[PDB]
Design an enzyme around this catalytic site. Structure first.
Site: not given
Ligand SMILES: O=C1c2cc(-c3ccnc(NC4CCOCC4)n3)[nH]c2CCN1Cc1ccccc1
Length: 340
Positions: A23-24, A27, A43, A138
């Site tokens: 992810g931005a 991880m 996460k 999203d």
């Protein structure tokens, strides 16, 4: 232990870490949960350097802690420092899934039985989310997780919002955040994405993708997207144009040469006919005429799975939808106390 040069202080309950995704601001890794004796997904989130990732983190945590559904990712545990000051990252423990629909779609041909089951699960999950007055905003194949028995789960609620139909209208070409290929056309023209009809459009896009293994409207840039949609759907009728009062938006549409609708049967000659009929309803240019989630579940394409009694809805809807990264650290901290 550490994964890909990123420290992972999730011990000592979870061991044998394996990289899963990124992810931005974070991880995703796999690990063996000792207290429950099985493999899980952890996460690591470091959003505290940006006010933006903090909003997403907060949003996501609050929702997932409040939702409980077969078709929605849950939070098993939350790991973090015991103090505000020591808190650098945050670890979300979740059920380990085998893959995501994005990966699956690039490698595998879907059978009709699979398309139907997956679509039903997405709708079941979506209905529950919409019943809580929440918009995902999203939906895409990458946000749909699968296990080995084809149970589907919805994840990534960072961009989620409480529905606000009253405040939705906006000007022509207003900036959006959600993934472009799954953007409803009204986002480009006059919408802020505060209606449930936007999720429906994304799901229609996902249906088309499962049908052909390719994105249906792969626009290169923001307005390119509109042309991809209109290329297939065709020029909007007079009634639908009458629904768009912003002159800049209406005049752009009027300036386009007439485009004829491409029949679904031509696009998907192998598709089930009941599937294509639902596909048409979901991908309706006019948001107001677009099929709602409960109606979609009732469609004859899904009749072997449809059971209103076994499609739950939320107990407590979300009542309502500037804070600096500081006060955002405090709340995240407060919302994570449960697990310490
Ligand atoms: O949230 C996630 C997330 C959650 C999972 C997950 C959960 C359960 N199970 C599996 N299993 C995987 C096995 C291999 O095939 C693919 C699925 N993955 N993956 C991801 C990658 C995208 N991010 C975004 C993100 C990440 C960090 C910080 C912010 C945002």
């Amino acid at each position: 232990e550490m994964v890909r040069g990123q420290v992972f202080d999730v011990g000592p309950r979870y061991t044998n870490l394996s990289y899963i995704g990124e992810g931005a601001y974070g991880m995703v890794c796999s690990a063996y949960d000792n207290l429950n004796k099985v493999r899980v997904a952890i996460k690591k989130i470091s959003p505290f350097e940006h006010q933006t990732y903090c909003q997403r983190t907060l949003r996501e945590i609050k929702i997932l802690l409040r939702f409980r559904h077969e078709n929605i990712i849950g939070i098993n545990d939350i790991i973090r420092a015991p103090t505000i000051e020591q808190m650098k990252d945050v670890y979300i423990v979740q059920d380990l899934m085998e893959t995501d629909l994005y990966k699956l779609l690039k490698t595998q041909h879907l059978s009709n039985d699979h398309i139907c089951y997956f679509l039903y699960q997405i709708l079941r999950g979506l209905k529950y989310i919409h019943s809580a007055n929440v918009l995902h905003r999203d939906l895409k194949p990458s946000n749909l997780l699968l296990n080995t028995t084809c149970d589907l789960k919805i994840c990534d609620f960072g961009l989620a919002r409480v529905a606000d139909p009253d405040h939705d209208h906006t000007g022509f070409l207003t900036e959006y955040v959600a993934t472009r290929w799954y953007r409803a056309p009204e986002i480009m023209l006059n919408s802020k994405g505060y209606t449930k009809s936007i999720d429906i459009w994304s799901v229609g896009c996902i249906l088309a993708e499962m049908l052909s293994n390719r994105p249906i409207f792969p626009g290169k840039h923001y307005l390119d997207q509109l042309n991809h949609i209109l290329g297939i759907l065709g020029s909007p009728s007079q009634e639908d144009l009458n629904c768009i009062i912003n002159l800049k938006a209406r005049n752009y549409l009027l300036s386009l040469p007439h485009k004829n609708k491409v029949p679904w049967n031509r696009l998907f000659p192998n598709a089930d006919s009941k599937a294509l009929d639902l596909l048409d309803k979901m991908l309706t240019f006019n948001p107001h005429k677009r099929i709602e989630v409960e109606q979609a579940l009732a469609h004859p394409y899904l009749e072997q799975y449809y059971d209103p009694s076994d499609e739950p809805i939320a107990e407590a809807p979300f009542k309502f939808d500037d804070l600096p990264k500081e006060k955002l650290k405090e709340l995240i901290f407060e919302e994570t106390a449960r697990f310490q």
